[PDB]
Amino acid sequence: HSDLTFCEIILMEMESHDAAWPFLEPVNPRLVSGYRRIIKNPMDFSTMRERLLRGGYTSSEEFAADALLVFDNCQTFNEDDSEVGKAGHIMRRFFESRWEEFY
Ligand SMILES: Cc1ncccc1N[C@H]1CCCS(=O)(=O)C1
């Protein structure tokens, strides 16, 4: 429980982060050409929010996996110096930092 309440703390802080705008909603393949083909397991903050609310996270490491999946998909699809890419690095570094503020 104390495990998964810090996940809420992290997810809340990630949802309201300045650089969270690319990862708030699922990627729209109708708008992002090639995303369907390149990324096989899309993930975003709202999907993590849906699952966490509904309790679908057995442990905190299942929560961290979905978080790292957001940024792996980001680095896979976006160049590091792209706008989404630059935001993904800010978000990936923020997550890992806050995550070790706990573990
Ligand atoms: C997270 C991400 N990964 C790859 C490409 C783009 C994005 N950003 C989103 C910006 C809002 C709408 S969107 O659906 O175009 C996609």
mmCIF file of C-alpha atoms and ligand atoms in Angstrom:
data_model
loop_
_atom_site.group_PDB
_atom_site.id
_atom_site.type_symbol
_atom_site.label_atom_id
_atom_site.label_comp_id
_atom_site.label_asym_id
_atom_site.label_seq_id
_atom_site.Cartn_x
_atom_site.Cartn_y
_atom_site.Cartn_z
ATOM 1 C CA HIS A 1 0.000 0.000 0.000
ATOM 2 C CA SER A 2 2.815 2.396 0.874
ATOM 3 C CA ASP A 3 4.386 0.907 -2.251
ATOM 4 C CA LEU A 4 1.497 1.940 -4.496
ATOM 5 C CA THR A 5 0.710 5.280 -2.849
ATOM 6 C CA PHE A 6 4.101 6.619 -3.930
ATOM 7 C CA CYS A 7 3.226 5.452 -7.446
ATOM 8 C CA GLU A 8 0.234 7.778 -7.196
ATOM 9 C CA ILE A 9 2.593 10.518 -5.978
ATOM 10 C CA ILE A 10 4.956 9.900 -8.907
ATOM 11 C CA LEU A 11 2.182 9.561 -11.487
ATOM 12 C CA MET A 12 0.496 12.724 -10.209
ATOM 13 C CA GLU A 13 3.810 14.586 -10.412
ATOM 14 C CA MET A 14 4.419 13.214 -13.905
ATOM 15 C CA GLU A 15 0.915 14.109 -15.111
ATOM 16 C CA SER A 16 1.392 17.737 -14.023
ATOM 17 C CA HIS A 17 5.013 18.058 -15.166
ATOM 18 C CA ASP A 18 5.766 20.788 -17.704
ATOM 19 C CA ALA A 19 7.199 18.294 -20.216
ATOM 20 C CA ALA A 20 4.423 15.695 -19.851
ATOM 21 C CA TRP A 21 2.354 16.952 -22.794
ATOM 22 C CA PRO A 22 3.475 14.209 -25.268
ATOM 23 C CA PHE A 23 2.584 11.399 -22.845
ATOM 24 C CA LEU A 24 -0.793 12.473 -21.415
ATOM 25 C CA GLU A 25 -2.984 10.629 -23.949
ATOM 26 C CA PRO A 26 -2.295 7.587 -26.154
ATOM 27 C CA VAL A 27 -0.520 8.307 -29.415
ATOM 28 C CA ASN A 28 -2.986 8.765 -32.282
ATOM 29 C CA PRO A 29 -1.727 6.633 -35.203
ATOM 30 C CA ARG A 30 -4.013 8.567 -37.561
ATOM 31 C CA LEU A 31 -1.860 11.633 -36.814
ATOM 32 C CA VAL A 32 1.586 10.092 -36.233
ATOM 33 C CA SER A 33 2.639 8.413 -39.469
ATOM 34 C CA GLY A 34 4.446 5.143 -38.829
ATOM 35 C CA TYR A 35 3.744 4.853 -35.098
ATOM 36 C CA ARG A 36 1.494 1.799 -35.468
ATOM 37 C CA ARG A 37 4.268 -0.093 -37.281
ATOM 38 C CA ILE A 38 7.284 0.877 -35.144
ATOM 39 C CA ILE A 39 5.891 0.768 -31.576
ATOM 40 C CA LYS A 40 4.388 -2.603 -30.682
ATOM 41 C CA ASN A 41 3.314 -1.874 -27.075
ATOM 42 C CA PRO A 42 2.232 1.774 -26.794
ATOM 43 C CA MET A 43 1.900 3.226 -23.310
ATOM 44 C CA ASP A 44 1.026 6.601 -21.819
ATOM 45 C CA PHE A 45 0.239 8.277 -18.514
ATOM 46 C CA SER A 46 -3.557 8.093 -18.808
ATOM 47 C CA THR A 47 -3.436 4.341 -19.446
ATOM 48 C CA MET A 48 -1.232 4.019 -16.362
ATOM 49 C CA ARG A 49 -3.742 6.221 -14.525
ATOM 50 C CA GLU A 50 -6.655 4.029 -15.636
ATOM 51 C CA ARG A 51 -4.921 0.860 -14.471
ATOM 52 C CA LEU A 52 -3.591 2.270 -11.191
ATOM 53 C CA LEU A 53 -7.011 3.630 -10.174
ATOM 54 C CA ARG A 54 -8.673 0.311 -10.955
ATOM 55 C CA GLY A 55 -5.940 -1.366 -8.924
ATOM 56 C CA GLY A 56 -4.482 -3.353 -11.827
ATOM 57 C CA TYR A 57 -0.902 -2.960 -10.534
ATOM 58 C CA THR A 58 0.161 -5.929 -8.412
ATOM 59 C CA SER A 59 3.423 -4.313 -7.266
ATOM 60 C CA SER A 60 5.310 -1.075 -7.795
ATOM 61 C CA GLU A 61 7.739 -2.664 -10.274
ATOM 62 C CA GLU A 62 4.847 -3.400 -12.617
ATOM 63 C CA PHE A 63 4.133 0.332 -12.378
ATOM 64 C CA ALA A 64 7.751 1.238 -13.158
ATOM 65 C CA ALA A 65 7.783 -1.099 -16.167
ATOM 66 C CA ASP A 66 4.890 0.746 -17.809
ATOM 67 C CA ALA A 67 6.635 4.039 -17.015
ATOM 68 C CA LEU A 68 9.895 2.958 -18.651
ATOM 69 C CA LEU A 69 7.852 1.639 -21.582
ATOM 70 C CA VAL A 70 6.584 5.184 -22.208
ATOM 71 C CA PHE A 71 10.144 6.462 -22.609
ATOM 72 C CA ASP A 72 11.524 3.439 -24.471
ATOM 73 C CA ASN A 73 8.765 3.933 -27.047
ATOM 74 C CA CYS A 74 9.616 7.645 -27.084
ATOM 75 C CA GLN A 75 13.330 7.082 -27.738
ATOM 76 C CA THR A 76 12.497 4.359 -30.270
ATOM 77 C CA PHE A 77 10.253 6.589 -32.379
ATOM 78 C CA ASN A 78 11.591 10.117 -31.798
ATOM 79 C CA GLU A 79 15.080 11.429 -32.457
ATOM 80 C CA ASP A 80 16.845 12.643 -29.323
ATOM 81 C CA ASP A 81 16.868 16.242 -30.593
ATOM 82 C CA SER A 82 13.220 16.222 -31.659
ATOM 83 C CA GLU A 83 10.668 18.090 -29.563
ATOM 84 C CA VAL A 84 8.891 14.981 -28.274
ATOM 85 C CA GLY A 85 12.304 13.381 -27.806
ATOM 86 C CA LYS A 86 13.657 16.283 -25.757
ATOM 87 C CA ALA A 87 10.531 16.159 -23.590
ATOM 88 C CA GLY A 88 10.835 12.395 -23.201
ATOM 89 C CA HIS A 89 14.356 12.777 -21.823
ATOM 90 C CA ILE A 90 13.193 15.379 -19.297
ATOM 91 C CA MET A 91 10.394 13.002 -18.297
ATOM 92 C CA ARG A 92 12.572 9.880 -18.216
ATOM 93 C CA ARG A 93 15.153 11.649 -16.040
ATOM 94 C CA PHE A 94 12.457 13.048 -13.745
ATOM 95 C CA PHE A 95 10.886 9.611 -13.284
ATOM 96 C CA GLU A 96 14.113 7.750 -12.488
ATOM 97 C CA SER A 97 15.110 10.537 -10.093
ATOM 98 C CA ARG A 98 11.831 10.519 -8.149
ATOM 99 C CA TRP A 99 11.782 6.708 -8.223
ATOM 100 C CA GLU A 100 15.103 6.438 -6.372
ATOM 101 C CA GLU A 101 13.894 9.123 -3.974
ATOM 102 C CA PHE A 102 11.864 6.108 -2.752
ATOM 103 C CA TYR A 103 13.882 2.965 -3.584
HETATM 104 C C1 LIG B 1 4.342 10.651 -27.456
HETATM 105 C C2 LIG B 1 4.627 10.702 -28.949
HETATM 106 N N1 LIG B 1 5.330 9.724 -29.485
HETATM 107 C C3 LIG B 1 5.606 9.719 -30.772
HETATM 108 C C4 LIG B 1 5.175 10.733 -31.611
HETATM 109 C C5 LIG B 1 4.437 11.780 -31.080
HETATM 110 C C6 LIG B 1 4.148 11.755 -29.722
HETATM 111 N N2 LIG B 1 3.380 12.839 -29.118
HETATM 112 C C7 LIG B 1 1.920 12.963 -29.122
HETATM 113 C C8 LIG B 1 1.545 14.627 -29.116
HETATM 114 C C9 LIG B 1 -0.143 14.824 -28.987
HETATM 115 C C10 LIG B 1 -0.956 14.066 -30.050
HETATM 116 S S1 LIG B 1 -0.133 12.900 -30.828
HETATM 117 O O1 LIG B 1 -1.080 11.786 -30.918
HETATM 118 O O2 LIG B 1 0.231 13.532 -32.101
HETATM 119 C C11 LIG B 1 1.256 12.224 -30.303
#
